[PDB]
Amino acid sequence: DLSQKQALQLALSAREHFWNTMSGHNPKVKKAVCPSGTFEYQNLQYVYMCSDLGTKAKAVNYLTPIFTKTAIEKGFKDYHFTVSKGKLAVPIGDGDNLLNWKKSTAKLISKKGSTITYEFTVPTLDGSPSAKRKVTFVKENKKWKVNQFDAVI
Amino acid sequence: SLNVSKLVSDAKALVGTPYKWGGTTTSGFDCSGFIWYVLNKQTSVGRTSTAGYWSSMKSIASPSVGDFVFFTTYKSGPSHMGIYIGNNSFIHAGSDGVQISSLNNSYWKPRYLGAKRF
């Protein structure tokens, strides 16, 4: 029971949550404070998450509706998240919105039980060749969720 | 101050390297991490975001080969950058890989903010 239409709306929500997390802030939380300052750790330059995503628990709770538990933990690992002085921190980085995900089309790749994989063909904003992006959805707590933090950018 | 020939050569050798947010290695670059990575082959330079390089680099009125070009994309102000390689072209790490693109591209052209020199 996850259609191509439904999968795209889910992927778009994954994208928004991934962008907000990597950007340090859920823009809906207007009260948030963004700790300033940078430090070097393990040969990377870090900045602090804003307060609304200031701890792993806050990040997990933001991401849990959309990403599976292991997707979130692997996201923390893959992107070298660290806790410095009790504050969640992320390496400096820049997003890239070239893939026009809203205008993509999907093909079924596979499905079994409560897992389904669609392959999205995503046009670019600048007319460079369209990109193939597979997204695997898993039903977790009887909700469809994306099983990889960074599948939709 | 840099070796421009080496800088452009090192950048071109990375064409096709996939994207990774925050990426600073040949397993994945973002636009500013690519710039940092190629610069760090010749000199010491802090890894900052694209807006960081917009602020720290030197203002110039047009790019020469080896200078850096900046674009506004997902937010206002500089949010994407690349290396000017001449012939109205620039190399940059993008969502679908390190690529050579044109400043005359109908998407990049109206979003070109300016150039800076390291």
| Backbone angle region of A50, left / alpha / beta, with phi > 0 → left and psi within -120 to 50 → alpha | beta
Which residues have C-beta within 8 Å of that of residue A74, sequence separation ≥ 6? A148, A149
User: Which residues in A have their CB inside 8 Å of a CB on B?
Assistant: 22, 44-45, 79-80, 90-99, 124-129, 131, 150, 153
Locate A57 and state its tokens. 């628990």
**Buried-exposed string A34-48: b where 16+ CB fall within 10 A, e elsewhere:** ebeeeeeeeebbbbb
For residue B110, what are the CA distances in angstroms to A69, A126, A140, B13, B44? 42, 12, 44, 28, 33
Q: Which residues of B are catalytic?
A: 31, 80, 92
Q: For residues B61 and B49, is the Cβ–Cβ distance under 8 A?
A: no
Which residues have C-beta within 8 Å of that of residue B107, sequence separation ≥ 6? A125, A126, A127
CA B17 to chain centre: 14
Using the structure block, give the residue that is written with the tokens 């109206």. Answer: B110
Please classify residue A31 by burial: count the beta carbons closer than 10 Å to its beta carbon, then call 0-12 exposed, 13-18 middle and 19+ buried: exposed
d(CA B63, CA B89): 11
- Residue B18: DSSP 8-state: P
Residues of A in contact with B21 (CB under 8 A): 22, 79, 93-96, 150, 153
In terms of CA atoms, which chain B residue is nearest residue A95?
A: B21
Which residues have C-beta within 8 Å of that of residue B83, sequence separation ≥ 6? B7, B8, B11, B35, B38, B66, B67, B68, B69, B90, B91, B92
d(CA A64, CA A30): 21
Residues of B in contact with A150 (CB under 8 A): 20-21
For residue A96, what are the CA distances in angstroms to A39, A60, A83, A84, B75? 24, 23, 25, 27, 10
Q: In this structure, which amino acid lies at residue A78? A: D
Q: Strand, coil or helix: what is A44?
A: strand
- Calculate helix-pair angle for B4-12, B31-39, nearest 10 degrees: 130
